[PDB]
Design a protein around this ligand. Structure first.
Ligand SMILES: CCCCCCCC/C=C\CCCCCCCC(=O)O[C@@H](COC(=O)CCCCCCCCCCCCCCC)COP(=O)([O-])OCC[N+](C)(C)C
Ligand SMILES: CCCCCCCC/C=C\CCCCCCCC(=O)O[C@@H](COC(=O)CCCCCCCCCCCCCCC)COP(=O)([O-])OCC[N+](C)(C)C
Ligand SMILES: CCCCCCCC/C=C\CCCCCCCC(=O)O[C@@H](COC(=O)CCCCCCCCCCCCCCC)COP(=O)([O-])OCC[N+](C)(C)C
Ligand SMILES: CCCCCCCC/C=C\CCCCCCCC(=O)O[C@@H](COC(=O)CCCCCCCCCCCCCCC)COP(=O)([O-])OCC[N+](C)(C)C
Ligand SMILES: CCCCCCCC/C=C\CCCCCCCC(=O)O[C@@H](COC(=O)CCCCCCCCCCCCCCC)COP(=O)([O-])OCC[N+](C)(C)C
Ligand SMILES: *[C@@H]1O[C@H](CO)[C@@H](O[C@@H]2O[C@H](CO)[C@@H](O)[C@H](O)[C@H]2NC(C)=O)[C@H](O)[C@H]1NC(C)=O
Ligand SMILES: O=S1(=O)NCN(C2CC2)c2ccc(F)cc21
Ligand SMILES: O=S1(=O)NCN(C2CC2)c2ccc(F)cc21
Ligand SMILES: O=S1(=O)NCN(C2CC2)c2ccc(F)cc21
Ligand SMILES: C=C(C)[C@H]1CN[C@H](C(=O)O)[C@H]1CC(=O)O
Ligand SMILES: *[C@@H]1O[C@H](CO)[C@@H](O)[C@H](O)[C@H]1NC(C)=O
Lengths: 253, 117, 50, 51, 51
């Protein structure tokens, strides 16, 4: 019902009843419509009009639905009416099917942010990070002028947008209109346990974890050989899928 | 643009800092810093509104005119509906006289509503 | 007949005429609401066909 | 990806240049130069054909 | 009225006046559109024309 406005769906119904009452009045009044379908005796005075009010309504409905009816005007005064109703229901049917192509395939939904620089321009969506993190520390030391715009928004309102934890950053995305900046290994866990959040951009930088040791500790080599042994064997992929599991969300639409 | 002129860092008449900034503004320009600073501050919410999308179900402002050329077609058809009443009496002119007394019969027999003959 | 009634339905489905038309207004409402059906099905079909 | 591993600037066992490059590679990374150099050489004729 | 140029809307109107005229002209001198009316009609030598 969408490709025509709800007054236009009424203006066609008021024209299908409008023309089909005018076509009845003209056919009853015109003398050339009266015909005798008596081939045996042509002067036996069996003049007749097909256009009763139930037949005049059926010409209007029959020409509107593009199937066509058995009724054809043969007086010229009813043949302009039958010729102008065929043009009206040529433009209505064509404008419907040329607007119905638009109201079926347009997109899923475009997000207002699609990257980090689109998030820097749109100052409606406020955004922050943890105020004790290396996510904050990256944007503070950066000078790449996409992240100078993002830190100038966050350093103005460090009370407002910057939060204390990852948990208080997700609750302000779920409730408020907010664009919290996590690290990509705890976006993958959140977007399985809660199928209403998403990851907007790609990756801003590349980092990685690591078992920290004091300065000059003897264990920084015996751990990094033991991590590589757990990675060639495939243990670090067995332990990731065990915990970052596959709880299940719809595909992408 | 009605004319063209530009932003000069003003100095008093006789300042030695005139040439030292004239060379310096060229140094930020040949490197590209004057384009970095302009596209950081003259950037912002670029106007989405112009583009398209998603909408414009056809209203009376869109289709519109076939409710006019229809009504002009039915008004014209009533004008040729009385024109076939007048010429039928002119083909009835070789019977009674030319006119009303033969015309008032056809005015009646249409109104009896399937009394056909 | 049941052969003639099914050739109305197939005929009005593929947008072509048939030699039989419904009189008797209770059968014109069937023949008029099957015309609005096949209008919307084919207009929805050829809209996605590109 | 079948696995995940990375490119290490090799040093002999006991080099003092190990930590001085370990800090240095982090310095090019936090500034963004390792993404500048990758998107200059792994750029090129991006395949049009798919569209 | 825009998706055809205003000379096309004239050329399809001079085609309706051109094809329907030559359909009338050919139906005058086509000796097979002189059919038999009155579907019983023992011949009676009276033929007519729809056009
Ligand atoms: C006797 C038989 C009669 C027919 C009976 C048939 C039965 C059914 C017949 C019709 C049913 C539907 C009614 C038709 C109009 C509906 C539109 C409407 O009302 O709203 C419109 C009014 O429209 C106008 O003001 C335009 C003026 C034309 C009025 C009719 C002229 C016909 C005669 C003249 C020719 C004579 C020539 C003679 C021969 C050569 C709103 O105005 P808008 O500007 O369009 O809106 C823009 C929206 N915007 C502001 C947001 C941008
Ligand atoms: C297919 C076979 C051939 C058919 C031959 C005829 C085809 C050639 C026909 C037209 C040729 C067009 C040339 C342009 C000149 C007039 C245009 C114009 O000035 O518009 C004006 C009027 O226009 C109208 O409102 C409609 C006038 C014609 C409608 C009736 C046609 C008769 C068809 C049936 C009989 C056919 C005759 C033959 C049988 C008896 C605009 O004025 P407006 O719209 O009122 O105001 C703007 C609306 N607004 C206020 C909201 C903004
Ligand atoms: C702007 C206007 C404002 C109002 C002014 C007043 C209106 C003035 C308009 C019209 C005058 C009204 C009276 C006309 C006489 C009616 C009889 C008739 O139609 O002849 C015959 C048609 O067969 C033909 O031979 C028609 C000849 C060509 C005319 C139509 C041209 C078509 C082009 C289209 C362009 C439009 C055409 C324009 C007009 C030419 C039928 O005659 P019959 O009775 O059936 O007898 C046959 C015997 N039988 C019954 C056994 C079969
Ligand atoms: C181009 C072709 C022209 C064809 C002629 C035009 C005919 C006029 C056709 C429709 C006009 C009326 C609807 C106006 C449109 C606005 C939307 C609307 O009101 O829908 C309202 C519902 O109401 C309906 O949807 C049912 C309307 C009647 C169905 C059409 C019958 C056709 C008759 C054939 C005539 C011949 C048969 C002979 C006698 C039987 C509500 O809005 P909604 O959006 O639907 O949301 C609710 C849905 N939800 C469940 C998703 C929540
Ligand atoms: C006859 C009885 C009565 C009928 C009455 C009703 C009929 C009404 C009939 C016609 C109504 C009016 C016609 C409108 C003109 C259409 C052409 C046109 O616009 O295209 C171009 C004209 O350039 C040409 O293409 C000219 C080619 C002429 C070749 C012969 C034509 C006759 C075909 C018949 C053979 C007979 C023998 C066959 C025997 C089996 C426009 O040029 P352009 O804009 O620059 O576009 C670039 C063109 N380019 C890429 C090609 C360069
Ligand atoms: C559907 O849209 C609404 C509004 O666009 C959103 O849900 C609410 O969004 C407002 C933000 O203006 C929050 O304050 C509310 O708390 C939200 N509602 C709830 C129940 O949390 C959201 O985009 C969508 N809501 C869904 C999918 O439930
Ligand atoms: O912080 S690092 O030690 N050095 C920077 N990088 C790569 C340059 C992306 C990476 C990539 C993945 C890591 F696990 C660690 C690091
Ligand atoms: O005012 S100016 O120094 N001299 C005039 N012009 C050019 C004539 C356009 C221009 C053009 C661009 C400028 F930035 C400055 C000037
Ligand atoms: O070979 S590593 O030094 N240790 C193993 N890993 C992570 C387990 C994937 C990674 C990940 C990214 C790297 F760049 C290097 C390494
Ligand atoms: C959970 C927090 C605050 C930690 C986790 N990794 C970063 C770190 O340990 O430096 C922080 C993430 C962030 O700042 O978004
Ligand atoms: C996302 O939020 C909605 C409403 O706020 C609710 O259905 C649920 O918490 C989430 N959706 C899913 C599918 O988990």
């Amino acid at each position: 019902l969408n490709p025509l406005s709800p007054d236009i769906w009424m203006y066609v119904l008021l024209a299908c009843l409008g023309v089909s009452c005018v076509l009845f009045v003209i056919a009853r009044f015109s003398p050339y419509e009266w015909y005798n379908p008596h081939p045996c005796n042509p002067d036996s005075d069996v003049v007749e009009n097909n256009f009763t009010l139930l037949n005049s309504f059926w010409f209007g409905v029959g020409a509107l639905m593009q199937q066509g009816s058995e009724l054809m005007p043969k007086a010229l005064s009813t043949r302009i009416v039958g010729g102008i109703w065929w043009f009206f229901t040529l433009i209505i049917i064509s404008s419907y099917t040329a607007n119905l192509a638009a109201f079926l395939t347009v997109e899923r939904m475009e997000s207002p942010i699609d990257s980090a620089d689109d998030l820097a321009k749109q100052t409606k969506i406020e955004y922050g990070a943890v105020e004790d993190g290396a996510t904050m520390t990256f944007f503070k030391k950066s000078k790449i002028s996409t992240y100078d715009k993002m830190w100038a928004f966050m350093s103005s309102r460090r009370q407002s947008v910057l939060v204390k934890s990852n948990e208080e950053g997700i609750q302000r995305v779920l409730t408020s209109d907010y664009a919290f900046l996590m690290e990509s290994t705890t976006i993958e866990f959140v977007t399985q346990r809660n199928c209403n959040l998403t990851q907007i951009g790609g990756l801003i930088d590349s980092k990685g974890y690591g078992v920290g040791t004091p300065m000059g500790s003897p264990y920084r080599d015996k751990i990094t050989i033991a991590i590589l042994q757990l990675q060639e064997e495939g243990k670090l992929h067995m332990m990731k899928e065990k915990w970052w599991r596959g709880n299940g969300c719809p595909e992408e639409e | 643009l009605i004319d063209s002129k530009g932003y000069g860092v003003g100095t008093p008449m006789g300042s030695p800092y005139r040439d030292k900034i004239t060379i310096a503004i060229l140094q930020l320009q040949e490197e590209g810093k004057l384009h970095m600073m302009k596209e950081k501050w003259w950037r912002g919410n670029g106007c989405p509104e112009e583009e398209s999308k998603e909408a414009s179900a056809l209203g009376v402002q869109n289709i519109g005119g076939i409710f006019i050329v229809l009504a002009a077609g039915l008004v014209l058809s009533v004008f040729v509906a009385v024109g076939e009443f007048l010429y039928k009496s002119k083909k009835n002119a070789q019977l009674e006289k030319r006119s009303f007394c033969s015309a008032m019969v056809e005015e009646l027999r249409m109104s009896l509503k399937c009394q056909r003959r």
